[PDB]
Symmetry: C2
Subunit: 474 residues, 2 copies
């Protein structure tokens, strides 16, 4: 194959740095013919399934129930058809029956290096060897974004149970960058961060796309210009935004830098297994030799053709602790397999990930993802940076209820200017979605901003009714 450090269990050279003039961390693995890589992925898939059969009673039980044993894996077609998908709910029941890490932990208790989790929540018991496999995978993908040794990398997401921050830090450390783990979550942190960014001038920033927006507003309140933070790029995970039309454009303009999308799931660390590159900068590439991504039809858990939408199903190829085999994300995306500008021979998610299928709501037979609303509003000059979607899942909705902020300049322009914006926002959303949208304007900067994941949907029946009645009155 010629694939660099290709073995299971994996064991990377910690002293390797690619040549300064190379675009790729691993030229072979990253640019080899996709058919040659798929044969090796298949080979690895067999090694992993044999490993899980031996060390995980969770997989042994689940696979026996679905009529599967690792020997029946003779092709990628066998994998999608015979191997049952793992659900997040299955991980919970396993952890409840086999505490604290479940019957899929595999490694002995003595090998566990870090404890993290979700916030029923699940605990991540990550082995020392996997932490190294995560750090190496992430340094490689960060190198792909043009991040280099000696670059100051600001990691600005909460350092707690959440894998995002730890994952970007482990990659910064392995890349021999100057890791700056400022973190997030505490009051007063954002006002302090903009001063640190102004002084330190980092080459790269990590966090959520929502935090990058809130931070530019904080920089402005603090009379600092975020274009003067010396940023070459910002790379995000945790929610949609980095591949959202007007959202990506707003962040790139605010910072005078490039935005990269990355991130699958915390259970799927190394989660940068889906990530854009410096040249293939729109959307994300599926780094197949790190984690095997399948975009599947939710009705049968089989791959959809390229050019079609489905749900990502993920498999670890380089993990011995809590390995995930066909973990169902429950998210929606579109994948293609056209030539990539960076020359990496990987499938692509050209529009990133639209959102979680469960987050979608229906209004008059029309299916709507919150990211579609965020996209339409961010492409408007008068939009103030925040909104809330007010829905009900208890009864059918005839119209979409939006609470939207106008900009401070639209507000300063007076009552007619505010009304013009409100009617224009209503029309634009109606044109994009093909559904009636009622817009209530709220005062600039009244809606809560976040340094984590934005929760713009208010699914409360009482709140929905109160707003519809209030909008019907005015």
């Amino acid at each position: 194959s010629g694939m660099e450090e290709w073995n299971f269990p994996v064991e990377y050279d910690e002293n390797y740095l690619p040549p300064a003039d190379s675009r790729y961390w691993f030229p072979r693995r990253e640019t080899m013919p996709a058919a040659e890589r798929d044969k090796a992925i298949l080979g690895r898939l067999q090694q992993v399934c044999q490993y899980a059969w031996e060390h995980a009673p969770f997989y042994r039980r689940k696979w026996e129930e679905a009529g599967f044993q690792p020997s029946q894996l003779k092709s990628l077609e066998d994998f999608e058809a015979r191997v049952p998908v793992v659900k997040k709910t299955d991980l919970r029941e396993s952890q409840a029956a086999h505490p604290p890490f479940g019957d899929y932990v595999c490694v002995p208790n003595s090998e566990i290096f870090h404890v993290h989790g979700t916030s029923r929540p699940t605990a991540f018991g990550i082995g020392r060897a996997d932490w190294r496999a995560i750090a190496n995978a992430h340094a490689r993908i960060m190198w792909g974004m043009g991040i280099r040794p000696g670059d100051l990398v600001c990691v600005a997401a909460v350092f707690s149970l959440y894998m995002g921050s730890w994952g970007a830090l482990a990659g910064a450390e392995r890349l021999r960058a100057k890791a700056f783990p400022f973190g997030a979550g505490a009051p007063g942190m954002s006002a302090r961060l903009v001063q640190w960014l102004d002084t330190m001038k980092p080459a790269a920033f990590y966090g959520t796309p929502s935090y990058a927006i809130h931070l530019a507003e904080v920089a402005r309140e603090e009379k600092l210009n975020p274009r003067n933070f010396g940023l070459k790029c910002l790379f995000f995970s945790g929610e949609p935004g980095a591949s959202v039309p007007g959202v990506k454009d707003r962040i790139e303009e605010a910072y005078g830098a490039k935005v990269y999308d990355c991130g699958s799931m915390a259970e799927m660390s190394p989660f940068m297994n889906v990530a854009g590159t410096e040249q293939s900068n729109d959307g994300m590439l599926c780094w197949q030799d790190i984690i095997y991504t399948e975009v599947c039809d939710p009705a049968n858990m089989r791959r959809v053709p390229y050019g079609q939408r489905g749900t990502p199903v993920y498999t670890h190829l380089e993990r011995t602790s809590q390995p995930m085999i066909r973990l169902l994300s429950g998210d929606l995306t579109l994948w293609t397999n056209d030539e990539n500008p960076c020359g990496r021979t990987y499938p692509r998610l050209p529009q990133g990930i639209f959102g979680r299928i469960d987050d979608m709501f229906t209004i008059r037979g029309e299916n709507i993802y919150p990211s579609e609303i965020d996209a339409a509003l961010n492409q408007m000059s008068g939009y103030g940076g925040e909104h809330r979607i007010v829905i009900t899942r208890e009864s059918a909705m005839d119209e979409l209820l939006l609470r939207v902020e106008p900009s401070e300049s639209v507000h300063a322009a007076g009552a007619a200017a505010l009304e013009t914006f409100r009617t224009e926002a209503s029309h634009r959303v109606q044109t994009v979605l093909g559904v009636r949208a009622k817009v209530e304007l709220v005062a600039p900067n009244s809606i809560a901003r976040t340094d984590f994941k934005a929760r713009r949907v208010i699914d409360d029946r009482e709140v929905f009714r109160a707003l519809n009645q209030q909008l019907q009155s005015s």
Copy 2:
């Protein structure tokens, strides 16, 4: 000497674990005759000063101004008398004139691994080799506290600029413990943590003594018992408390576990260079072969005899990046050199560190440290867990003004029970300090608790005057 891995620059075996039956991580370095260790410390002090002279223009300039060159270091007496102390203000001016890390960074920019700091603030540019020297030093000292490989260690302090959390995590990682970096700082974190502690049952907890108190109150609100978190110990740094009479007793009782004191300064990472051990569990030992501690008279920066009070002055023996040579802490302590129950041949701070000399205030010619008030109040059954000291530095104070919380049970007992507590608190503080104390009772749980460092002194002239006038009225 026989001192384990004794070289400069230091380079520890990452695979070494002491035998399961050993009390000491490094038996020689930890238990050798103090006179034999002091000759080696002197030798190392020369290596460090030669290193700083060569690589730091900050030290070259400072030492030339004080009439010192490394060749004049012929004894420990020469070190205290000839070497000028470094002040935190000197570090600031150096960072302003030579941004971002100052003219004491020493290592090339390319060697910087992590960026942290204070919150003018100073930036810490820590090299890869020093991060390893910190992790090894901390695993060694944590082993001394009885913490072992495979033990679940909850690191519950903010992961941001602050060195405390990162330092305890690096030690947990190197000790091959199950590092659980939950962190702190965000709203809702404490309510979630008590559930994680109840489920996971960790062997050890790290944070501030103030956070441990607040967390037991949160565990109780959440109808959980903190004695059932399976804790064998809690180890703290960042402020006094872990060697404070009634404070140490309250935490040990609340959790049914042992409390260990550790911590010098963030500039002095590995900051566990002052730490108690499982057997010498009261106060802290000065781990002299990691960092050279001198308890000095502030009037001349020369060592005080054992049995006397002074200010800790610290020197790195195993750091190449931002090495601190005779950094003045500005804190107050007492040191002794009697036999230790663990058998470690190190000097001791039997009462830990009293506080920062600048935090001290005077009332009618009597010098008072806030930790003395905290000690007197915590030794009272009716005390509710929080208080504020209200002072003025602009004018002379005749009496001490205290805002004290009674317990919920003292409050439920009625007006006479509240009055009895208020007068008893006033008397007790008067007896301990030998000064008049005015006590104003505030409602239970009204005073802000913290997951960081407690700021109990309100030094505002308007607030002081408003309280004295209000107390004079009632």
